[PDB]
């Protein structure tokens, strides 16, 4: 038995830096840094410089040689990647606890020590084009990701890639500026897992001072709702039709998560009729062929939308998508069971469970705690807050979704598809 198992220490640096040492007695090493540098903080002054930087960790560093850095990184042979999110960019090192300091040093370097070398940068450029290649690549990178690119619409769609028209144009001015403009203690979140809150505090102190963030959530990112319309010639059509949800942290946010579960998503047990949803069960009763619809969460603190990602062959798109809306209408009827509600709470709440879970999808989930939670409203309290599940707002919500301007998204030719004005 550990001396009573260490409770992860949540804190904020007195400086206004997010100071998080989650004491983990676990054997391995998990090192997060959550950055407001995620796409939200991004700006139209630049393009893909986060796609870039996302590549550019390897770049020539101030006081650290990307080859020498590569020698230490390459040396321990551990896990260091900053993570690309709309909210954050996260410097991650999972490794043997020993090199942590070096890692930390590397970390300290990685974060704080860009040289942004012209020569180096220029070189780096092409690897991006490679990157965008990966980005758009395959029905995951294409029909999911490029049809994320063909799905994701707003400044969240400000890409994990860059713009084509922007191609090759990055500036080192835009580097030192960009971080100087973007990178900041405003973006500063440090999260230890496995280490000494004291030691993390040690390097943290002697190292990490910064500041300097900026303004706003979007145009209301211009709410076109409506189509991002894409002629594809996709063979089997890839169309995805966008309902909406609610903002991050919104009171109803959780409720939106319900509605998600209500229509549900991919099953925990494979190979099934998708028997579980009016979007699915009534895609089951409704639909006879390949189809998918699901709700996103594009969660600003400010706003949000949960669409339906959709999949089907062209012929039924009017048929299906209309039926989609139809089922949506049908759904918005407010007809629901109680076992719908509870067994939902089982399904989705379990969502929070595996969603919270284990050593990697700990570091990615309990590391979406060790980064992305911020406290435990425990599976006690957050699943109390989850137990705070309440159905009616899903009815009035059914209206609410029915009530807005939402988006449609097009991959294909609409010759069989609806255009949503003709809806």
């Amino acid at each position: 038995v550990p001396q009573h198992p260490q409770d992860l220490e949540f804190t904020r640096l007195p400086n206004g830096l997010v100071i998080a040492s989650l004491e983990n007695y676990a054997p391995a090493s998990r090192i997060g840094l959550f950055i407001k540098a995620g796409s939200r903080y991004e700006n139209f002054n630049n393009l893909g410089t986060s796609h870039l930087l996302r590549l550019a960790s390897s770049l020539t560093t101030k006081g650290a040689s990307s080859f020498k850095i590569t020698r230490g990184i390459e040396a321990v042979g551990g896990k260091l990647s900053v993570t690309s999110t709309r909210e954050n960019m996260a410097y991650t090192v999972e490794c043997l606890r020993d090199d942590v300091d070096i890692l930390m040093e590397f970390l300290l370097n990685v974060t704080t020590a860009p040289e942004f070398r012209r020569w180096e940068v220029a070189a780096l450029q092409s690897q991006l084009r490679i990157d965008k290649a990966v980005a758009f690549q395959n029905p995951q990178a294409h029909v999911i990701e490029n049809l994320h690119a063909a799905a994701y619409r707003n400044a969240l769609a400000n890409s994990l890639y860059c713009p084509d028209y922007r191609i090759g144009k990055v500036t080192p001015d835009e580097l030192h500026d960009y971080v100087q403009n973007h990178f900041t203690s405003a973006r500063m979140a440090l999260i230890g897992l496995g280490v000494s809150h004291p030691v993390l505090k040690q390097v943290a102190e002697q190292f990490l001072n910064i500041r300097g963030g900026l303004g706003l959530s979007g145009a209301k990112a211009k709410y076109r709702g409506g189509e991002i319309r894409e002629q594809n010639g996709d063979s089997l059509v890839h169309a995805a039709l966008v309902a909406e949800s609610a903002a991050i942290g919104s009171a109803e946010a959780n409720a939106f998560s319900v509605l998600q579960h209500v229509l549900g998503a991919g099953p925990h047990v494979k190979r099934g009729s998708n028997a579980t949803s009016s979007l699915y069960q009534a895609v089951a009763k409704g639909v006879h062929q390949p189809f998918d619809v699901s709700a996103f969460n594009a969660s600003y603190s400010d706003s949000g939308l949960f669409g339906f990602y959709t999949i089907s062959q062209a012929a039924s798109a009017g048929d299906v998508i209309k039926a989609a809306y139809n089922q949506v209408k049908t759904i918005a009827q407010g007809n629901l069971s109680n076992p719908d509600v509870q067994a939902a709470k089982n399904k989705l709440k379990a969502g929070y469970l595996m969603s919270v879970e284990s050593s990697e999808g700990f570091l990615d989930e309990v590391g979406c705690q060790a980064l992305a939670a911020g406290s435990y409203t425990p599976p006690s309290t957050v699943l109390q807050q989850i137990d705070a599940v309440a159905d009616a707002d899903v009815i009035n919500a059914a209206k609410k979704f029915v009530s807005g301007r939402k988006s449609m998204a097009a991959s294909g030719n609409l010759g069989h598809t609806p255009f949503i004005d003709e809806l």
Binding site: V18, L160, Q260, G266, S294, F296
Partner: protein, 57 residues
């Protein structure tokens, strides 16, 4: 008390040099695997995927 993550099958890229890239982000879209003629490819001007390193005690 600060939250980023988990809704399964959307995209918020994760990439590195040591590693490779990916985005599994919040929201779905992964459900398509069902039909007959389940086919699937390789061999022409492409990328693929899937690596990792995992071992033991």
């Amino acid at each position: 008390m600060l939250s980023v993550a988990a809704r399964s099958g959307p995209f918020a890229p994760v990439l590195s040099a040591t590693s490779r890239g990916v985005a599994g982000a919040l929201r779905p879209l992964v459900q398509a695997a069902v039909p007959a003629t389940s086919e699937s490819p390789v061999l022409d001007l492409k990328r693929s995927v899937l690596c990792r390193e995992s071992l033991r005690g």
